[PDB]
Design an enzyme around this catalytic site. Structure first.
Site, short mmCIF file in Angstrom:
data_model
loop_
_atom_site.label_atom_id
_atom_site.label_comp_id
_atom_site.label_asym_id
_atom_site.label_seq_id
_atom_site.Cartn_x
_atom_site.Cartn_y
_atom_site.Cartn_z
N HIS B 63 24.37 2.72 81.56
CA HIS B 63 23.39 2.88 82.61
C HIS B 63 22.39 1.70 82.70
O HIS B 63 21.94 1.17 81.68
CB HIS B 63 22.66 4.19 82.41
CG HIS B 63 21.96 4.66 83.62
ND1 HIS B 63 22.52 5.55 84.50
CD2 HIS B 63 20.75 4.34 84.14
CE1 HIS B 63 21.68 5.79 85.49
NE2 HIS B 63 20.59 5.07 85.29
N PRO B 64 22.09 1.23 83.92
CA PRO B 64 21.16 0.10 84.01
C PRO B 64 19.74 0.46 83.61
O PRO B 64 19.30 1.63 83.79
CB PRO B 64 21.18 -0.27 85.50
CG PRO B 64 21.71 0.92 86.20
CD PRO B 64 22.63 1.62 85.24
N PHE B 105 16.23 3.10 78.49
CA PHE B 105 15.33 4.13 78.94
C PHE B 105 15.79 4.53 80.34
O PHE B 105 15.79 3.73 81.28
CB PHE B 105 13.91 3.59 78.97
CG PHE B 105 12.89 4.57 79.45
CD1 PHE B 105 12.64 5.73 78.73
CD2 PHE B 105 12.16 4.32 80.62
CE1 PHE B 105 11.71 6.66 79.18
CE2 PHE B 105 11.20 5.23 81.08
CZ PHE B 105 10.98 6.43 80.36
N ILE B 106 16.22 5.78 80.47
CA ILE B 106 16.83 6.23 81.69
C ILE B 106 15.89 7.27 82.32
O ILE B 106 15.45 8.26 81.66
CB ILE B 106 18.17 6.86 81.40
CG1 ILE B 106 19.14 5.81 80.88
CG2 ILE B 106 18.73 7.57 82.66
CD1 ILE B 106 20.41 6.45 80.22
N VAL B 109 13.63 8.09 89.37
CA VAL B 109 12.44 7.37 89.75
C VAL B 109 11.97 7.71 91.18
O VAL B 109 10.85 7.34 91.58
CB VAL B 109 12.76 5.87 89.52
CG1 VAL B 109 12.39 4.99 90.71
CG2 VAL B 109 12.25 5.39 88.17
#
Lengths: 155, 155
Positions: B63-64, B105-106, B109
Site C-alpha cells: 500500500h502507498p 501508515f495506512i 483520508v
C-alpha cells in the site's frame, strides 16, 4: 542538513517505485540543493537521463496507470466526474496500449479533460516503440515536476 | 459479460499491487456481481479476509504511503494546501511508523484534515503489532470502498 535517509524518503517516490533515482541524486550532492521544485527536479531528471535504457524502461513499467491515479484521487477529493463506463474505457485503452508497448499509458494530466486524454491515446497508440519511449519518458518527467511542485516552493 | 482479463484489470488495483484479490474474486463468481461499489467491495473484501496472514501482510506492505497519495493528487488537482514542511512531517511520521510496524501508515483520508491525521498517528504509533494490524487492515478495506465508490454506482 538533509540526511540521505530523509532525502530518499522524501523524493524516492517522485519517480514511482524508483528510489535509486533519489539515491544517486543524493550521491551527486543532493543535500546541497535548494529545496525547490526546480532544483530538485533538475537533479532527479539528471539521474533519470543518465540511467541505462533498461533502468529507464523499469521506471516506465513501474509507473501507475491512469485508473490507478484516478482511484487515488477518489480517496481524497472534468476527470473527477467520470462515468463508470469512462473509467472502464480508460482501463481498456490502457490494456491495449501496454499490450502494444509493454508499459502503461503514461500521461501528465493536470488541466486535462477526458477528451484530451482520448485524443492523446488516439495519436500515441499509432506511434512506434522509439517515439513512445521518447514521449513516455518525457511525460514521466513531467509528472515528476508536477509532484515536486505540490511539495516544494517552485524556485 | 465481464471477462477475467477485464475484471482483474478493472479491480486488480483496488487493493494496491494485489491483483490476486481480484483473480480469486473472479473465480468465486465475480462476473455475476452487480457492478456496484457495494457488491464488488463485498466480493473483494471477502477474498482479503480469507487470504493467509502472510498475504494480508503483503497487501499492507504494498500500500502507498500518505506522501505518495498526496503527490498523485497534486498531479490532478485542507490536505490539498500542505506546507513543504507539513509534507515533510508526513514523510517523517511514516518512516517512524514503518520502522516500528514494518508496513506504511495506512489511513483513509476522505474528509480528513491535517490535524485528523496527526491525531491518528499519535494514537496509533502507541499500539502493539496486533492492534495496528487490525486497524491497518480495516483502513485498507476502507480505501477499497472509497476507490470503488468513485468508479461505480454505490448500490
Amino acid at each position: 542538513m538533509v540526511t540521505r535517509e530523509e532525502f530518499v524518503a522524501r523524493f524516492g517516490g517522485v519517480f514511482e517505485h524508483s528510489p535509486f533515482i533519489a539515491e544517486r541524486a543524493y550521491d551527486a550532492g543532493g543535500a546541497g540543493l535548494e529545496l525547490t521544485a526546480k532544483a530538485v527536479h533538475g537533479a532527479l531528471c539528471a539521474q533519470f537521463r543518465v540511467a541505462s535504457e533498461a533502468e529507464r524502461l523499469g521506471v516506465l513499467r513501474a509507473h501507475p496507470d491512469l485508473a490507478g491515479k484516478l482511484a487515488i484521487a477518489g480517496e481524497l477529493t472534468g476527470l473527477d466526474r467520470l462515468s463508470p463506463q469512462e473509467h472502464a474505457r480508460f482501463t481498456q485503452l490502457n490494456s491495449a496500449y501496454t499490450e502494444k508497448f509493454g508499459f502503461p499509458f503514461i500521461i501528465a494530466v493536470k488541466g486535462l479533460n477526458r477528451h484530451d486524454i482520448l485524443s492523446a491515446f488516439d495519436t500515441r497508440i499509432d506511434n512506434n516503440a522509439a517515439q513512445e519511449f521518447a514521449t513516455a519518458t518525457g511525460q514521466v518527467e513531467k509528472i515528476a515536476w508536477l509532484r515536486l511542485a505540490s511539495m516544494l516552493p517552485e524556485g
